[PDB]
Structures are given as C-alpha cells and as structure tokens.
Amino acid sequence: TGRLNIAVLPTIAPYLLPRVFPIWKKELAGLEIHVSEMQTSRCLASLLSGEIDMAIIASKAETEGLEDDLLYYEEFLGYVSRCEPLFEQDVIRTTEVNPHRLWLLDEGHCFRDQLVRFCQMKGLHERQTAYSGGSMEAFMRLVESGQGITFIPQLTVEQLSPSQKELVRPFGMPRPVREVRLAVRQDYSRRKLREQLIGLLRSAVPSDMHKLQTGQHLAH
Amino acid sequence: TGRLNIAVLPTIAPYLLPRVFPIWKKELAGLEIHVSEMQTSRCLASLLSGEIDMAIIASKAETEGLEDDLLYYEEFLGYVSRCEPLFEQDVIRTTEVNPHRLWLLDEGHCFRDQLVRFCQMKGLHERQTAYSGGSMEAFMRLVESGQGITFIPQLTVEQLSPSQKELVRPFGMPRPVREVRLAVRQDYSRRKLREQLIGLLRSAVPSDMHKLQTGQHLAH
Numbered sequence: 001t002g003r004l005n006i007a008v009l010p011t012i013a014p015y016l017l018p019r020v021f022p023i024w025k026k027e028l029a030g031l032e033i034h035v036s037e038m039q040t041s042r043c044l045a046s047l048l049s050g051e052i053d054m055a056i057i058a059s060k061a062e063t064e065g066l067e068d069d070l071l072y073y074e075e076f077l078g079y080v081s082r083c084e085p086l087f088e089q090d091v092i093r094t095t096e097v098n099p100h101r102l103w104l105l106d107e108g109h110c111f112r113d114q115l116v117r118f119c120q121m122k123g124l125h126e127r128q129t130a131y132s133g134g135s136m137e138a139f140m141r142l143v144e145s146g147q148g149i150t151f152i153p154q155l156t157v158e159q160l161s162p163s164q165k166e167l168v169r170p171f172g173m174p175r176p177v178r179e180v181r182l183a184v185r186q187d188y189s190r191r192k193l194r195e196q197l198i199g200l201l202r203s204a205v206p207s208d209m210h211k212l213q214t215g216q217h218l219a220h
Numbered sequence: 221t222g223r224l225n226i227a228v229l230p231t232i233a234p235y236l237l238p239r240v241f242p243i244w245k246k247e248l249a250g251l252e253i254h255v256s257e258m259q260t261s262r263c264l265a266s267l268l269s270g271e272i273d274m275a276i277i278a279s280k281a282e283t284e285g286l287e288d289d290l291l292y293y294e295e296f297l298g299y300v301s302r303c304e305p306l307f308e309q310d311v312i313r314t315t316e317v318n319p320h321r322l323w324l325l326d327e328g329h330c331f332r333d334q335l336v337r338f339c340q341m342k343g344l345h346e347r348q349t350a351y352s353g354g355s356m357e358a359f360m361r362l363v364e365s366g367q368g369i370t371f372i373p374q375l376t377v378e379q380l381s382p383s384q385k386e387l388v389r390p391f392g393m394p395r396p397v398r399e400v401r402l403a404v405r406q407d408y409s410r411r412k413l414r415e416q417l418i419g420l421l422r423s424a425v426p427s428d429m430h431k432l433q434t435g436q437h438l439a440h
C-alpha cells in the first residue's frame with residue numbers, strides 16, 4: 001500500500017490523464033494517488049523539496065538533484081481559424097504565420113523558447129490585445145471563434161469534434177515534437193514503483209509515439 | 221489611448237474572452253490591452269499592488285482597498301459521464317452525486333466552498349486518485365471519457381459540440397449561479413475607462429445574464 005503524489009503539466013493533464021486513470025485503477029490498486037497540475041517550475045521545485053514524488057513534464061528537467069525518463073514524443077499541430085488565409089493551405093507555413101494573430105503559451109509553446117521560430121518572431125508582440133498566462137482551452141476557443149492561430153498537442157486530436165478537426169493543420173517536415181517525460185529526484189527510493197509508473201504511462205499511448213518517427217524533429 | 225492591464229480567472233477566460241476581444245478591437249481601438257489569466261488571490265493582490273488595473277473575478281473582492289461591479293450571473297451546470305447513474309436523470313440531484321466520482325475545482329467550484337453541498341460532501345476524498353488544482357478542460361475530458369461528474373459554467377455550453385451537449389445536466393431549482401464581477405482599487409484613477417469596460421464586458425454576454433433570474437440562487 002501507500003501514497004503517491006504526482007504533478008502534471010496543464011498542457012498534458014487533459015490529454016493524458018483521461019487515458020491513464022482507468023489503467024491506474026486496475027494496476028495501482030491499493031495505492032492512494034494525489035494528482036496535481038503545476039507548470040514546470042513548480043514541478044521541479046516540488047520534486048526537490050519532496051512535496052511531490054514524481055512529475056510529468058514536457059521537457060528534460062536539466063536540474064541538479066533531479067532526473068527524468070522518456071514517456072513519449074508528441075507533435076505540435078497548427079490549429080487554424082477559418083478566417084486565417086492559412087486555412088486554405090494544407091500545412092502550416094512558418095513564413096505565413098501572422099505574428100499579430102498568433103496565440104502562444106508562455107510555457108506550452110515557449111518554455112525556453114521551444115518553438116523559437118514563433119516565440120521570437122518579429123511582430124509577435126504587436127497587437128492590441130496581449131495575452132499572457134493564457135490556457136490551451138482559451139486559445140482553442142479563440143481559434144474556433146475565428147480569431148487567430150495556436151498550436152495543439154497531438155493527443156488532443158482524438159478528443160476533437162468533426163468541426164474542430166477541420167481546423168487542424170500539421171506542420172511541413174520536419175514536424176515539431178515535444179517530449180513528455182516522467183521526472184523525479186535522483187535519490188527517489190521507490191525504483192520498482194517508478195518502473196511501474198513509467199510502464200503504465202507509456203502503455204497509455206499508442207506505441208508509435210514511444211519513438212521519434214521519420215519526419216519528426218524535437219523542437220528546441 | 222493608453223495601456224490597460226486586466227486579469228481574468230482561468231475559469232472565465234476561455235468562455236468570456238472570445239466574446240469580448242472582437243468588441244474591444246472595435247470599441248477600444250488605440251488602447252493597448254494586456255490580458256493575463258490569474259487566480260482570485262493573485263487578482264486581488266495585483267490590484268492592490270498596481271501590477272494590474274482590473275480583474276474579472278467570480279466573487280466579491282471583500283477586501284479593504286478594493287471594490288467591484290457586477291457584470292453578470294452564470295449558472296453552474298452538471299457535466300455527467302455516460303457511465304454514471306445520474307446520466308439517466310434529467311437534472312443533477314444532490315443525494316445522487318457520488319463524491320467518489322466527482323471532480324471539483326479548487327476555486328472554480330469551492331472558492332470559500334461556494335458549492336458547500338459538494339465541497340463539504342462526505343467521501344469526496346475517498347478515492348484512489350485525488351485530483352488537486354485540476355483544470356476545467358481536464359475535468360471535462362475526464363467526463364467525456366465516461367469518468368465522473370463535474371460542473372461547468374453556463375457560457376461554456378454554446379462552445380460544446382452536439383455530443384458534449386449530451387452530457388449536460390442542469391440543477392434542480394434553486395439552480396446555483398456565480399457572479400462575474402470587475403474588481404478595481406477603490407482609488408482607481410481612470411473612471412471613464414472603468415465605466416466603459418463595465419458596459420463593454422456586459423455587452424459580451426446575453427442580457428438575461430445581467431440579472432438573477434427565477435429559479436437561480438447566488439451560490440454560497
């Protein structure tokens with residue numbers, strides 16, 4: 001028996017957890033699991049201090065005292081409003097992405113400038129309404145309403161309605177991907193549970209995602 | 221026309237902003253606007269600190285130095301999975317809400333335990349997975365995968381697909397609502413702008429939401 005305190009990114013929680021919860025019930029029976037959503041900073045801080053046992057993140061921790069393991073890769077996809085000129089195109093054209101109509105998550109897209117081609121593109125901050133601290137939910141709602149463009153995680157596609165799927169435009173190759181990883185402290189003394197968790201989370205997604213597929217590139 | 225810093229709760233943003241942005245662009249041309257999503261605690265402190273000028277919250281500030289104006293009332297609705305006993309019912313029923321399969325938002329549903337019935341319901345924590353500080357999006361996805369019950373704000377409905385609309389269950393009267401309000405420093409110096417934002421934000425939602433209708437009760 002025992003208890004497990006695990007954090008999860010807001011840009012992962014909605015897409016991954018629906019898949020994992022049923023799997024935990026059957027495999028992790030006898031264990032009380034406390035799930036919490038945090039952004040990366042909180043995750044790394046909580047891991048170190050011992051506030052949480054594990055953290056599901058979208059990047060390497062690269063933090064003294066912590067370590068992480070690959071769970072799966074996940075492509076970023078264009079979510080393009082029906083009002084954008086780019087809607088008539090089949091793929092996202094970097095050079096046609098209008099900086100003034102782009103919604104970027106500070107940490108979802110621009111954690112250490114991951115999608116740098118957009119995070120640091122000229123004209124980005126030139127618009128009436130600046131949006132900071134925004135959520136994927138908000139951004140998608142905006143796009144669906146005909147305002148702008150944003151980027152959504154592959155795992156969310158199967159959750160999308162027929163109408164929503166129409167807004168999806170993948171990238172031209174190479175396609176941007178983030179890495180979803182399970183982070184802990186180096187001295188984490190539950191190696192067997194850790195091992196079990198890694199397996200369960202990885203089994204929560206299609207195996208194809210376990211490895212970088214030709215045509216995909218880790219966004220840096 | 222100047223700069224305006226305005227914060228909005230994560231539980232309101234995705235539902236209100238797509239409505240207002242189109243309005244602000246026409247009516248507030250020339251004014252620089254910086255929107256950021258914040259929780260109620262940060263909104264209040266940021267108002268008192270000057271970091272932000274306005275905050276769209278879901279409660280009365282009830283804080284020395286701050287005041288606020290009503291924008292509109294918004295119903296909480298049941299969001300029930302197809303697997304749940306309640307699914308065959310027409311409306312949410314206190315007694316028949318299984319605390320072990322309920323997803324509640326820290327501030328979204330239990331700000332000062334606004335929804336006391338559920339926020340303080342026996343067994344709410346008797347589960348395998350305690351979900352801390354989850355997002356509305358995550359809870360909605362969990363419900364859509366046949367996992368549990370949550371409550372969502374009325375303004376979300378119009379955004380839902382047909383399928384998602386099948387999961388909606390209204391409360392029996394009195395139906396619980398929250399109040400969405402605009403909060404400012406009592407000494408805020410831009411009065412005309414304040415009055416303009418109050419009118420504009422109220423024009424962003426159906427006028428029937430401006431007042432508390434029959435069968436509705438301000439949750440507390």
